[PDB]
Amino acid sequence: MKVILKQDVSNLGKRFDVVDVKDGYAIHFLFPKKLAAPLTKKSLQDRDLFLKKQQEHYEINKALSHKLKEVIEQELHFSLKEHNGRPYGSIITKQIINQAHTKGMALQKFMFKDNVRLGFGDHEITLHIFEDTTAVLKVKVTPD
Amino acid sequence: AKKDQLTLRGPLYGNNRSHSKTITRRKWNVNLQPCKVKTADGKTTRILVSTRTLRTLKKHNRL
RNA sequence: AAGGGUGCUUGACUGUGAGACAUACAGGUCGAACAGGUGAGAAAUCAGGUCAUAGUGAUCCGGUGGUCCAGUAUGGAAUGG
RNA sequence: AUCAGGACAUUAUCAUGUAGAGAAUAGGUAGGAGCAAUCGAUGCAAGUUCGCUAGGACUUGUUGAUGCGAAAGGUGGAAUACUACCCUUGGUUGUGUGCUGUUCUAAUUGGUAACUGUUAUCCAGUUUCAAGACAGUGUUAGGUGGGCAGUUUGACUGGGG
RNA sequence: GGACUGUUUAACUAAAACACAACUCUAUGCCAAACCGUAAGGUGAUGUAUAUGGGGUGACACCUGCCCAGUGCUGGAAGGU
RNA sequence: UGGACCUAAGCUGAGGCUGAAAAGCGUAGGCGAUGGACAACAGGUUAAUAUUCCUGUACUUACAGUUAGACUGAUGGAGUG
RNA sequence: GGAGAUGGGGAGCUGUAGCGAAAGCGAGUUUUAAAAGAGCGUUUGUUUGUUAUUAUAGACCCGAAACGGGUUGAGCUAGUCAUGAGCAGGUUGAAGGUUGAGUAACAUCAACUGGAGGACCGAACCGACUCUCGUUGAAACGAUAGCGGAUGACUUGUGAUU
RNA sequence: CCUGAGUAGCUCGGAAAACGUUAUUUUGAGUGAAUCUGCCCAGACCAUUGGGUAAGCCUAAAUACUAAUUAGUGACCGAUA
RNA sequence: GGGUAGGUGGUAAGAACCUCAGAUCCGGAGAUUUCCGAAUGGAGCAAUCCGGUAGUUGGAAACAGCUAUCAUUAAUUGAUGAAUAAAUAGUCAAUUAAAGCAAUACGUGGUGAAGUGAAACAUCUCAGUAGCCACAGGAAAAGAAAACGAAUGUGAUUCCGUGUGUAGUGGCGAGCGAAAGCGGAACAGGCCAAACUUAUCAUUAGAUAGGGGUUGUAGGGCUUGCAAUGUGGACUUGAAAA
Ligand SMILES: [Mg+2]
Ligand SMILES: [Mg+2]
Numbered sequence A: 001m002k003v004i005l006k007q008d009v010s011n012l013g014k015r016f017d018v019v020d021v022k023d024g025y026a027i028h029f030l031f032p033k034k035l036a037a038p039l040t041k042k043s044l045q046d047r048d049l050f051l052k053k054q055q056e057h058y059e060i061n062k063a064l065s066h067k068l069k070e071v072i073e074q075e076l077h078f079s080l081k082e083h084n085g086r087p088y089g090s091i092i093t094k095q096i097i098n099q100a101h102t103k104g105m106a107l108q109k110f111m112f113k114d115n116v117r118l119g120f121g122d123h124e125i126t127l128h129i130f131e132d133t134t135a136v137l138k139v140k141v142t143p144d
Numbered sequence B: 001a002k003k004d005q006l007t008l009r010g011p012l013y014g015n016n017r018s019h020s021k022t023i024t025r026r027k028w029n030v031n032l033q034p035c036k037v038k039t040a041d042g043k044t045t046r047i048l049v050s051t052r053t054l055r056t057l058k059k060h061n062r063l
Numbered sequence C: 001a002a003g004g005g006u007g008c009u010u011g012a013c014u015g016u017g018a019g020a021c022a023u024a025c026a027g028g029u030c031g032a033a034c035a036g037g038u039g040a041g042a043a044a045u046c047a048g049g050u051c052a053u054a055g056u057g058a059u060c061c062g063g064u065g066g067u068c069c070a071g072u073a074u075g076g077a078a079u080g081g
Numbered sequence D: 001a002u003c004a005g006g007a008c009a010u011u012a013u014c015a016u017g018u019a020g021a022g023a024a025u026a027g028g029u030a031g032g033a034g035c036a037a038u039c040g041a042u043g044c045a046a047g048u049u050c051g052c053u054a055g056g057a058c059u060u061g062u063u064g065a066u067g068c069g070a071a072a073g074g075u076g077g078a079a080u081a082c083u084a085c086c087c088u089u090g091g092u093u094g095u096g097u098g099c100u101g102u103u104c105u106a107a108u109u110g111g112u113a114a115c116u117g118u119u120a121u122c123c124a125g126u127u128u129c130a131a132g133a134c135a136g137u138g139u140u141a142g143g144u145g146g147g148c149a150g151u152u153u154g155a156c157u158g159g160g161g
Numbered sequence E: 001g002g003a004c005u006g007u008u009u010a011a012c013u014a015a016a017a018c019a020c021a022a023c024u025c026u027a028u029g030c031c032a033a034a035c036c037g038u039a040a041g042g043u044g045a046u047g048u049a050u051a052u053g054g055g056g057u058g059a060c061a062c063c064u065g066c067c068c069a070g071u072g073c074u075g076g077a078a079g080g081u
Numbered sequence F: 001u002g003g004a005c006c007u008a009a010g011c012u013g014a015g016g017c018u019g020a021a022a023a024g025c026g027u028a029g030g031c032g033a034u035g036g037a038c039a040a041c042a043g044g045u046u047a048a049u050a051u052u053c054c055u056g057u058a059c060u061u062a063c064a065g066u067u068a069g070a071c072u073g074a075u076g077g078a079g080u081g
Numbered sequence G: 001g002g003a004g005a006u007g008g009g010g011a012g013c014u015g016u017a018g019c020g021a022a023a024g025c026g027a028g029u030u031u032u033a034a035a036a037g038a039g040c041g042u043u044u045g046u047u048u049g050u051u052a053u054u055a056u057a058g059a060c061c062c063g064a065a066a067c068g069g070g071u072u073g074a075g076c077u078a079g080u081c082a083u084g085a086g087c088a089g090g091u092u093g094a095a096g097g098u099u100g101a102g103u104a105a106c107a108u109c110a111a112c113u114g115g116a117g118g119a120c121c122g123a124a125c126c127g128a129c130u131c132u133c134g135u136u137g138a139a140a141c142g143a144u145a146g147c148g149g150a151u152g153a154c155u156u157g158u159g160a161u162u
Numbered sequence H: 001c002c003u004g005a006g007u008a009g010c011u012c013g014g015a016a017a018a019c020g021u022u023a024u025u026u027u028g029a030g031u032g033a034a035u036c037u038g039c040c041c042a043g044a045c046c047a048u049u050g051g052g053u054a055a056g057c058c059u060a061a062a063u064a065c066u067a068a069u070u071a072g073u074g075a076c077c078g079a080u081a
Numbered sequence I: 001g002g003g004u005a006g007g008u009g010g011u012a013a014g015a016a017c018c019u020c021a022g023a024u025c026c027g028g029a030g031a032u033u034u035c036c037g038a039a040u041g042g043a044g045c046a047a048u049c050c051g052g053u054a055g056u057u058g059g060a061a062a063c064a065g066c067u068a069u070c071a072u073u074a075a076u077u078g079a080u081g082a083a084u085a086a087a088u089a090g091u092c093a094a095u096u097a098a099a100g101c102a103a104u105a106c107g108u109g110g111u112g113a114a115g116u117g118a119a120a121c122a123u124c125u126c127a128g129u130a131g132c133c134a135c136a137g138g139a140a141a142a143g144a145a146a147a148c149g150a151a152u153g154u155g156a157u158u159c160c161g162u163g164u165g166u167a168g169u170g171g172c173g174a175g176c177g178a179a180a181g182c183g184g185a186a187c188a189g190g191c192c193a194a195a196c197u198u199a200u201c202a203u204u205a206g207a208u209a210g211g212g213g214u215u216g217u218a219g220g221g222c223u224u225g226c227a228a229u230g231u232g233g234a235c236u237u238g239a240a241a242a
């Protein structure tokens, strides 16, 4: 088992620390955003170097998150079949992701927060890029 | 085949020695679970893997 | 009298057993005599359950009590005897 | 993953209890002769709990320096303040477990649909939809189980039953 | 006697047996239940309770009484093991 | 009559699914007439063959080369079958 | 080593001290307080040949019905499935429909049409109720003569399947 | 500093080993260590003493068998063998 | 090459030839080697049917001669490419292996009965036997101690005799039956992982190829010196000889 947390303080009192209890296949193991620390060098060996790498990926998380914000705010156009504005089917996170590759951006659909769009027109969708960084993406649904 | 794919550990054949020691041939099947895995080329795959190797995969961080 | 009453006790002993009976085997039955330490009795004597004949069931396995037995190298123990 | 509930321990915290006599609500064994005052009394107001309708205590606000017959009286089998250890019963922050009960999803499932490999009702992959840590599945353990299997089911016997 | 027409023990029994139309009871809410298969898979069904499987009676008419102690079946919510 | 055309029940079955093993299931494809589609009649002859050979008269399906006309129109859609 | 007798090969086997459950003791030893008593002992070998008997292997021979495992068979027959064929001949004359009467309009009735049915009589066809014959037969289940169904839950060929 | 981790063990069901499950050895399910002052072993077990270092691989020879090629043998058969 | 004087396979005489320019015959090496058959272009009722592709010849052209090639699977290499932008699945091509058979025998491994014995029978035995199945091999398997096991001890494995029908195990019934020790046949023990070091991988290497090192009277690595040039084979190519 690997006790480590990363990128935030999640659901309990802790820090960017190894303060992690044995849960096994839980929020520890199906969350590929927190360290799986091997405690054979994570006492003092992997302490400072991985700490500085944490700040490196932390600052480049701000960096690339801001860059993808610039990409987002420099509009997703998803065309759909609508009956005078009300659609036949529905615009969910996967369509929004796939259409965001028209901007060259590969984003996970799990960062796109919200419920299914059933209408023509504009929608501002919240994008959880990181624990403390959320972007606004404009999504435009047009009749085809 | 009801054996796993990482290793080839198959069923074990033994006796159902009940009370009064009547023998009856019986099979033991490995615990097979559909947990995923990630290879070092992408190609995430779903493989029927036994639980004993699932633990090894879990500690070597092969997911 | 081997029956009835009384006094005293517990031989309703331990360790044995020459010689016989009847027996396919297993088993059963009787018993002089010897050592230890006793009871009754003045003493001789008697007493190893009852007047006699039935009243009971192998082996294996496991348990219980004692032990001048062993204890998978040694000391113990477990486990056996 | 998360929230709620109640149970038993305990970290820190209070109390809790009426046979009579005993100035009174005596739970047991001690060290015990003094003890209180800004870790603030007499008199009063409110209240949780408790109930012997009388009492206890805890918690607050005002009060302000004179006090304890619940030290010494006196009782009684056990005797009074003050520092401790042990019982009955309740509330608390706290964990530790599991127990039922919710919600949510990423594991997982699909004989919901769409798409591609593809001229393919199997299949694999992506998405959707419904379920949802249940189900199915491996081991382990109870129950019903002639559906199924291997077997016994005596002998004498004026024939055998 | 059985309602009928039919089927049956090739090669000793064609019948009063079996079937049947109709009746009732029960199971089953769809990945249905039952079933074959170790499982995949498949039937049921390219069906959906006016449908499907099973038990029992056996056209048509009239009737189908009493007992829920025992066995079985269904439900139960506190307790006991 | 049948292949070289077609498919039914069904059989086989790349990949694939399931199964200690062999094998089992199954998709695309492929096979599979008892069926669909396809153009020849009469008479004569030999010991033995005959819509097969011969005589007489026919039709079909391909292939080029040629004359004239016309823009053809499928591995797929539809109708017919 | 002549697919030899044999030579090497002492590792082991039996006998030479028994008794006791055993440590142990030792011509004694176990039981026993007992050195009494009793039990058991206080020397008669071994290796081969041959014969009798015996043990484990089928073990004198022949003899089951059966038990289990793997395969081969649905070309007869039973069922299902695809696809085809067959039922001479003759009767009865349904339901429905058209018309006429009747009905306030129905209902009902009469004529005509129509041509149903697990219908009728009976050959091919299928089946197999009775007698007689034959029963080492013509025949490993039949013949003459009768017999039931014969447009249907029918009969039958070809192919596939359990 | 290194000396083979879901590993040796421990638990639930079974078995190989002479042993009918027991030290040793293997394992379908669950859990799960240590690092030369170590780890395992000497029929449950602990201490002392002593032996050996798993959890990685490879290995001729002696051994089993002869349908086959060649030479040859037989106190083996001699056409119901 | 040998070897001579006959020969053209047996039921087989005759007919017609070859041969003593050295045939037939015998031995070595070669080539041919229709069709089916693992069968493999596609089928299929085995030994038959129907083809594609690329050459060449004939032909005016269909078409016919004559050649080669055309299964699936696995590994590797290259190209291409989806839902989806990249990527992977997939598809196409090239090269290399096997798929099968049999010696009714031997070996290993998986799975695994019953008859019978117990005077019946279930625990048990028959039996890990037969059978089914996979896999080779000339032999296989096993194997160089986390050992034996009771000692001033042996020192990989295998096989034979004995230990012994013992110690034990068994409804303590039937039955089963070692491991030590001892005498023998044969005899060899080698090599990786990891410490450390090198080069390179967006070096996030935790990866790729080297050096180094192989273990128990503990060893190896790390720092420092001396002695070494050699045996040895579980083994590559040539030459010569028997
Ligand atoms: Mg008496
Ligand atoms: Mg008496």
Ligand SMILES: [Mg+2]
Residues within 6 Å of the ligand: none
């Ligand atoms: Mg000892």
Ligand SMILES: [Mg+2]
Residues within 6 Å of the ligand: E058
């Ligand atoms: Mg009836």
Ligand SMILES: [Mg+2]
Residues within 6 Å of the ligand: none
């Ligand atoms: Mg009746």
Ligand SMILES: [Mg+2]
Residues within 6 Å of the ligand: H042
């Ligand atoms: Mg020991």
